[PDB]
Design a binder for these strands. Structure first.
Ligand SMILES: Nc1ncnc2c1ncn2[C@@H]1O[C@H](COP(=O)(O)OP(=O)(O)OP(O)(O)=S)[C@@H](O)[C@H]1O
Ligand SMILES: Nc1ncnc2c1ncn2[C@@H]1O[C@H](COP(=O)(O)OP(=O)(O)OP(O)(O)=S)[C@@H](O)[C@H]1O
Ligand SMILES: Nc1ncnc2c1ncn2[C@@H]1O[C@H](COP(=O)(O)OP(=O)(O)O)[C@@H](O)[C@H]1O
Ligand SMILES: [Mg+2]
Ligand SMILES: [Mg+2]
Lengths: 131, 329, 325, 348, 261, 261
DNA sequence: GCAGACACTACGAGTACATA
DNA sequence: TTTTTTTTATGTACTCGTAGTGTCTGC
């Protein structure tokens, strides 16, 4: 758990690393962070999303890129691909005997991963255009 | 022309500037004339002037050019293991006493080893100092400085002459603070200086820091009692009366409310223990209730000195005084 | 010639006749030396009683100045005394002959309680094998840190605390050799505050003579900072005779007036708690509370709260003692 | 960027609460001869924001350009230990508690090298450097004893701003050498004003009742209040007055643990509760916060004549936990003592 | 597009060894005049500047002012795989997040390409005042390296004095003082052994040993070395590396002891 | 004012490397006759008596007599960086603590002044008896070093005997015994390789091999060594330097107890 | 005369334990 | 009828692996 905490902390930008200790980030800014990162999203294309849904997706990928969190595909012995966070902070947050909560679907997490990839390349192009 | 904080600007350069520690200052002034300086063990509360006295004595004895050749100052900020005592301290104590003062002032025929903060040294490293102090006493001297004399072993206690630095009385501390405020062109009222010497509790470093910070806060105008109460962290009497009313109520919900309100206001638990202790010893409670409550206050202060949680210790103390106040109701 | 030395090192008993207290032990050691029957010695006792001075006087009596460096191997806690030193320099010193003059050699091991158990186990057959050639003197303050195998091989002498009746003439010799004006109560305060230790009685004498120029009772108790007997009697009378507030005010005024420390007050009140004919249930509670208060003063703890608890430990038992009748 | 970091104030004149303290801190650091500071208060009060505002007031706007620096320190046991450091061109930010019991080796070696050297450029930078020792209450007493002569010798070229939660864990030699600055937690009105200004700058509308409930549930922690407000905005955009506020899992896990304690008093239930306490200690929750949550939930189930005894037992086993090294022994001893007291109270 | 070509592969293979244990990263500033690197250490004591002009390269392409941030631990292992007399081409795209180094194998049969991830570091230029120094002297490079190495076995901090006579190195410790001097060595056949003085005001400043050792780790790039000192300005150690450019080291002095009378 | 001047630095290096693992600290007794050093080892078993003459130095001045006790590890580190063909100046003031070693670099360009802090040990003078010995053997130093190295492989304590025939070495060890006896080896072309017996009464004494092997490290100082033995006085190993002085090693016999049977 | 091979001791590194 | 792993902070002692290095062999 300490190795996972240090791996989560070392990925954040140093401008926001100084604003909170890892202890306070673990106690206060992890479960609420995961509740921020998991909104109610229909499994529909962004094209059919409303302008408000596009703004919510832009805010979601902004706070995903701020903390260097991303979804990647994981293999299972049962034969089904899944999407999981590459820093797996759900085991940092969640507890065994705690009431179940609704997870995001496969289409929504694939949409978030594709959006974070195109947002990283758009950020690279914007930084090339500024410089 | 850089500014310097007043704790270092008003450090005693000579032994005549050290305040209230008359016996050790008289011993060091006799040793300045040529008397046989013994091994020294300075111990007492923080801020009483143990380091400044021996640095002023070393500066008076050796001058500027012989401080690097006659004084070895080791503190807890550097490594003092068994090998540092066996190699570095013994080889320094075995050196010759050469070098004379160029200003014509007399120079003593010994070196000085200032082992500041000797509490942190281990028992083996303190046991390695014994025959180094005894055997090399012709050419060097030792000055152990600590806050607790119980953490220094009894052979080193026996080998050194023990001087206890008392907390500074209100007369000497007030005189020194008024001299510092006169030399800095700042004006402080009598109520302000009375509350300052009440708050500082014999810590002259704390008093100089509070005086400098009150000067910087007000900009150089008159320092009243209100800025001293603001910067000293003193809990107001309304909070203490509310705590005692919550204890006299006998309900634990109001007790939890006032404890959480004092914790959320960031008040230090040591200050709350001091103010509650003053209120308890200065009211009309019975002797048994005062006895039990002051014993719990001492236990709570000991627990806070061991780094326990403030909220749990304060709620335990508040539960004890609530039980005592509701016993007679 | 005049030398700038502390009085605990300027006035050292270079001969066995200058030590004061342990006359039977020193007579036995003198008869060991005069008959050349000196065994492996084990000198133990509290600090400041004259064990290192005893073995240095014996070594200077046994050996001349032209051969002292080849016959005596003195090692202490400032030296490295690991098992490679027992197998190295100590074994080579014990197993070889002398250089200049024929005789038996001496290995002084000062602070023998600081040695590791491996070194103490390696020393056993070095002591037993070369008894004819060399002799060993182990000196310690704590006998429990020396293994029983080394305690069996060395005959042990308990250098107990120096009685104040025999501590006075040596202090008088130091006073008459230093031109110090001292009264009878000053000497009594010196031998009271020393408590079987001649280091602390010389240190206190030198410190008082430098601080004040005279050595009386008031000057000694002011330079040391120790409370007087009358102050402790007043503190006990206030804690047993009146309520919490008046006793607290009087003890606080007495501590602020004279600059007293709570550790010495606790020690003297502990000494007074056994002379006073308390009930046995009261004495157990008082000793437990005073031990707790003494333990709480070893850390960063406010001394005013601990003074209030010291008053509280007696204000608890006031009505118990009175109603016991 | 979250709402905790997007609308953080940059200067001392932009603080929503403790404005008098902001003016006093601006007057304190203007001359440059200010002593070492000890910023203490509850978590989430705004201590680090005020420290960064003090640094802006001292140096330029270059204190916001921070970077990660890695240092390798050799212990006396010759074990190389890696320590991260937030740094700028004017100051450094060190957390020595990441070295644990080796934190003294950070103070004796890494810090003094900072203190013993003057600065490169004395025009863009000022006459002194600042070192921010974060969370000095978690330092061992050896490190705090190594701190004091470094703080006293080189205080004209290196100023220090220690930050902590409780000053009782700081030794009196360190507290004597620094000016203690108390930052209390903001009140309910201040947190409601902060949340209203954040929602207005985001273009949203926030009811007063919802902001009052957020400030009540956050327990005067502005960071947790802002995170809860942003989570409530994410999970439901129309801000209802009775909207369900999300909660942390370890807090509700502590509540369920204390419910499991008070439900049955048996050694089998004690072994289940010990498993729950390992689950809590597994997720890097500090044991004093576990003890505080256990007390705060168990006092809701006790009677009026048992709460003082339960609180005294909690404080006693918390102190014994601080004296020791294995938290599970003292936690299970507290739970077993409470079970014995609760069984005695219920059967009598 | 950043495209640079080296004329000799030994320049990087003698300039990256000093920065291996000195600075934690390499920040290259791309400009029309040349490449600039200004890095401060983690202790905020030492500062490294390296300015290589565009005329010293075989070819140099620069259209936009860019900055690349590379680590040192991977670049040091990449440098040791390269040869000595081979050519090294540095390539960096406008949109990519990596830097490519292409050189020749030591077997001289294949081309080796190594790619490094560009670390996004947020730094600012400190800005040297470039003020007039109170003492400027010239020394041999290898002699200065031997001088700094000889005082390593004596003490952990050295004292540099510079009067009009010459430059005096001292190292006072528990063993004893080691004092060496250099003065008036202009009567030699080689032009690189001329120890000369160029200013007037004498200075005496105490510096650390490890930073001067890391500074003398970059000796054989230049034949001579230049030392600059003043009352409060840091020590400046300058190498004029052939024709491509120059390297500067800034070392802050130690805090002086309380030697009041 | 004391000022000695070694014409070459090799002899001081050989002396301080002979005593490095043996002597704890060097006590140079200074007079107008020369430089004397009588120091025991750390085990108080061996004794070293070095006597260097004033005529062997380049310049030797001594106003008042001195006794300079100094550490040996520091002087060993100073003499490690000293040439074998350079002039080395030892300086000492009247009432100062700095013993100065001034020498030149191996490049023979720059000067080097290394100070040492004198120790303040009060050491009682050890009386050398200077009596007649019952066995005096002149033998080559290299053969003595070789035979000590060859007996170090067999045992640890060696019984050396001497009689009218010659010297004899025995090592009763764990592998077995090794008995090497040499005599009348003066019938060669060389003059250094010769065994000469001068005295009468046979002696047999047992010594440690570690101290003999430490004593044999002065082999380049003298081509011919002298062994003096008797029934009471210790083992003396005398090295006669060519034009500087001499070196005496004293080693005490071990305690050997016969079997009761 | 100089390159290769041999054992030699000094030094760096990992590990355990410390009680009656 | 039941078995894995690193923290405690120094100081010492043991054990083992590695690397300059003095010396011997040979063309
Ligand atoms: N007796 C005194 N006379 C004059 N100034 C004093 C005195 N005591 C303290 N001061 C001032 O307070 C500063 C702190 O004094 P110190 O000598 O460092 O205290 P201290 O005895 O070292 O406390 P500790 O135990 O080390 S925390 C000094 O630099 C002075 O400015
Ligand atoms: N019996 C004594 N007679 C005279 N002076 C004494 C006597 N005992 C102690 N002293 C004084 O105390 C000094 C030191 O005594 P030590 O020989 O160190 O005693 P010790 O009991 O061996 O101490 P420890 O146990 O090693 S700390 C002497 O040089 C005297 O000044
Ligand atoms: N004056 C203020 N106005 C608005 N927000 C604030 C103010 N002060 C603090 N905050 C916010 O409250 C949080 C407090 O966290 P921090 O500043 O790290 O204090 P602490 O160190 O006590 O937790 C920060 O995230 C900050 O954004
Ligand atoms: Mg101090
Ligand atoms: Mg002794």
């Amino acid at each position: 758990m300490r190795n996972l905490i240090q791996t989560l902390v070392s990925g954040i930008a140093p401008a926001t690393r100084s604003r909170a200790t890892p202890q306070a980030l673990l106690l206060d800014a992890l479960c609420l962070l995961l509740d921020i990162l998991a909104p109610k999203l229909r499994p529909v294309s962004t094209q059919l999303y409303s302008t408000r849904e596009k703004q919510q997706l832009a805010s979601l990928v902004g706070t995903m890129l701020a903390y260097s969190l991303t979804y990647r595909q994981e293999r299972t012995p049962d034969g089904q691909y899944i999407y999981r966070l590459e820093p797996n902070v759900e085991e940092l947050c969640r507890f065994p005997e705690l009431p179940a909560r609704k997870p995001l679907t496969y289409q929504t997490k694939q949409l978030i991963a594709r959006e974070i990839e195109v947002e990283k390349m758009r950020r690279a192009e914007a930084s090339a255009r500024v410089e | 022309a850089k500014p310097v904080p007043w704790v270092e600007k008003y450090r005693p350069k000579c032994v005549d500037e050290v305040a209230f520690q008359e016996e050790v200052v008289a011993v060091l002034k006799k040793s300045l004339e040529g008397a046989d300086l013994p091994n020294l063990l300075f111990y007492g509360p923080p801020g009483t002037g143990k380091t400044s006295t021996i640095l002023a004595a070393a500066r008076e004895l050796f001058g500027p050019e012989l401080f690097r050749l006659r004084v070895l100052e080791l503190n807890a900020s550097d490594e003092r293991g068994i090998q540092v005592v066996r190699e570095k301290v013994k080889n320094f104590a075995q050196l010759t006493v050469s070098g004379s003062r160029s200003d014509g002032k007399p120079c003593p025929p010994f070196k000085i080893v200032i082992l500041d903060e000797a509490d942190s040294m281990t028992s083996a490293a303190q046991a390695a100092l014994r025959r180094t102090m005894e055997k090399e006493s012709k050419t060097t001297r030792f000055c152990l400085i600590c806050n607790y004399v119980s953490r220094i072993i009894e052979p080193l206690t026996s080998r050194c002459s023990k001087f206890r630095f008392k907390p500074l009385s209100d007369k000497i501390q007030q005189q020194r603070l008024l001299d510092i405020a006169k030399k800095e062109n700042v004006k402080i009222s009598d109520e302000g200086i009375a509350y300052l010497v009440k708050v500082s509790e014999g810590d002259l470093r704390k008093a100089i820091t509070f005086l400098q910070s009150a000067t910087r806060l007000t900009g150089g105008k008159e320092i009243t009692e209100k800025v001293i109460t603001d910067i000293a962290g003193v809990i107001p009497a309304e909070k203490i009366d509310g705590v005692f009313a919550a204890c006299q109520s006998g309900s634990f919900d109001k007790l939890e409310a006032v404890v959480k309100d004092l914790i959320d206001e960031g008040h230090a638990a040591t200050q709350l223990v001091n103010q509650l202790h003053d209120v308890v010893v200065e009211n009309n409670l019975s002797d048994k209730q005062k006895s039990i409550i002051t014993e719990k206050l001492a236990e709570v202060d000991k627990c806070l000195a061991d780094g326990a949680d403030e909220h749990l210790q304060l709620i335990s103390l508040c539960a004890t005084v609530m039980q005592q106040l509701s016993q007679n109701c | 010639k005049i030398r700038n030395l502390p009085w605990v090192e300027k006035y050292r008993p270079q001969t066995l006749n200058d030590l004061i207290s342990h006359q039977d032990i020193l007579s036995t050691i003198q008869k060991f030396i005069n008959e050349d029957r000196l065994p492996h010695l084990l000198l133990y006792g509290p600090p400041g009683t004259g064990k290192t001075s005893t073995i240095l006087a014996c070594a200077k009596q046994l050996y001349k100045d032209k051969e002292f460096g080849s016959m005596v191997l003195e090692l202490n806690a400032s030296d490295d005394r690991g098992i490679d030193i027992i197998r190295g320099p100590i074994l080579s010193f014990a197993s070889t002959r002398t250089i200049f003059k024929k005789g038996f050699k001496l290995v002084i091991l000062d602070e023998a309680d600081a040695m590791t158990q491996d070194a103490q186990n390696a020393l056993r057959r070095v002591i037993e094998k070369f008894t004819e050639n060399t002799r060993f003197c182990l000196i310690c303050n704590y006998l429990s840190k020396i293994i029983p195998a080394l305690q069996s091989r060395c005959t042990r002498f308990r250098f107990g605390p120096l009685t104040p009746e025999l501590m006075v003439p040596r202090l008088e010799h130091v006073v008459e050799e230093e031109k110090v004006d001292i009264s009878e109560d000053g000497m009594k305060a010196l031998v009271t505050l020393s408590s079987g230790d001649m280091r602390r009685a010389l240190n206190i004498l030198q410190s008082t003579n430098m601080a004040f120029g005279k050595v009386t009772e008031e000057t000694v108790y002011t330079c040391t900072g120790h409370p007087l007997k009358s102050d402790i009697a007043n503190i006990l009378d206030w804690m047993l005779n009146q309520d919490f507030t008046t006793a607290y005010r009087n003890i606080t005024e007495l501590k602020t007036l004279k600059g007293l420390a709570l550790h010495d007050i606790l020690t003297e009140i502990h000494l007074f708690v056994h002379r006073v004919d308390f009930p046995s249930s009261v004495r157990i509670h008082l000793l437990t509370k005073m031990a707790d208060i003494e333990y709480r003063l070893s850390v960063g703890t406010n001394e005013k709260i601990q003074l209030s608890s010291l008053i509280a430990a007696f204000q608890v038992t006031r009505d118990l003692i009175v109603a016991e009748a | 960027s979250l709402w905790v970091d997007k609308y953080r104030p940059c200067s001392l004149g932009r603080l929503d609460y403790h404005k008098e303290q902001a003016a006093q801190l601006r007057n304190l650091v203007q001359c440059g001869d200010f002593p070492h500071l000890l910023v203490y208060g509850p978590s989430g009060a705004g201590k680090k924001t005020r420290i960064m505002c003090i640094l802006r007031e001292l140096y330029g706007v270059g204190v916001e350009k921070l970077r990660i620096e890695h240092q390798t320190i050799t212990t006396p046991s010759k074990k190389k230990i890696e320590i991260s450091t937030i740094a700028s061109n004017y100051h450094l930010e060190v957390n020595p508690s990441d070295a644990g019991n080796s934190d003294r080796v950070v103070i004796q070696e890494m810090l003094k090298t900072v203190a013993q050297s003057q600065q490169l450029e004395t025009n863009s930078q000022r006459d002194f450097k600042v070192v921010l020792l974060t969370e000095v209450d978690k330092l061992t007493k050896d490190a705090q004893h190594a701190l004091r002569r470094t703080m006293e010798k080189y205080m004209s070229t290196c100023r220090l701003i220690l930050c902590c939660n409780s000053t009782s864990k700081v030794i009196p030699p360190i507290r004597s050498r620094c000016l203690a600055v108390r930052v209390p937690a903001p009140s309910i009105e201040d947190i409601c004003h902060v949340l209203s200004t954040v929602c207005k700058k985001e273009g949203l509308n926030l009811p007063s009742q919802l902001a009052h409930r957020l400030a009540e549930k956050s327990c005067r922690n502005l960071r947790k209040a802002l995170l809860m407000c942003e989570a409530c905005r994410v999970q439901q955009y129309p801000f209802t007055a009775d909207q369900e506020i999300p909660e942390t899992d370890w807090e509700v896990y502590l509540r369920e643990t204390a419910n499991a304690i008070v439900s049955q008093q048996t050694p089998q239930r004690l072994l289940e509760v010990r498993g729950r306490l390992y689950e809590l200690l597994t997720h890097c929750i500090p044991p004093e916060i576990i003890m505080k949550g256990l007390l705060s939930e168990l006092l809701h189930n006790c009677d009026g004549q048992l709460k003082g005894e339960v609180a005294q037992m909690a404080a006693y086993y918390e102190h014994r936990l601080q004296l020791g090294s294995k938290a599970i022994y003292h936690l299970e001893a507290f739970v077993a003592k409470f079970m014995a007291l609760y069984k005695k109270f219920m059967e009598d | 597009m950043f495209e640079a070509r080296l004329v000799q592969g030994s320049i990087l293979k003698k300039v990256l060894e000093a920065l291996k244990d000195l600075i934690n990263e390499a920040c290259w500033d791309i400009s029309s005049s040349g490449v600039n690197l200004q890095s401060m250490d983690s202790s905020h004591v030492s500062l490294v500047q390296l300015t290589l002009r565009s005329e010293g390269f075989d070819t140099y392409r620069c259209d936009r002012n860019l900055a690349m941030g590379v680590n040192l631990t991977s670049m040091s292992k990449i440098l040791k795989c390269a040869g000595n007399e081979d050519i090294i081409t540095l390539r960096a795209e406008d949109n990519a997040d990596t830097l490519a180094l292409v050189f020749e194998a030591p077997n001289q049969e294949k081309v080796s390409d190594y790619e490094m991830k560009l670390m996004d570091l947020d730094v600012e230029q400190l800005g040297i005042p470039e003020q007039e120094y109170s003492c400027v002297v010239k020394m041999p490079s290898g002699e200065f390296a031997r001088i700094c190495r000889d005082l390593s076995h004596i003490g952990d901090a050295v004292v540099i004095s510079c009067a009009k006579d010459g430059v005096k190195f001292s190292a006072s410790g528990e063993l004893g003082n080691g004092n060496i001097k250099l003065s008036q060595t202009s009567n030699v056949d080689k032009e690189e052994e001329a120890v000369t003085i160029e200013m007037n005001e004498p200075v005496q400043l105490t510096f650390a040993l490890r930073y001067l050792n890391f500074f003398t780790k970059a000796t054989p790039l230049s034949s001579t070395v230049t030392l600059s000192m003043s009352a409060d300005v840091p020590l400046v150690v300058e190498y004029k590396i052939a024709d491509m450019g120059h390297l500067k080291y800034y070392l802050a002095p130690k805090i002086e002891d309380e030697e009041g009378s």
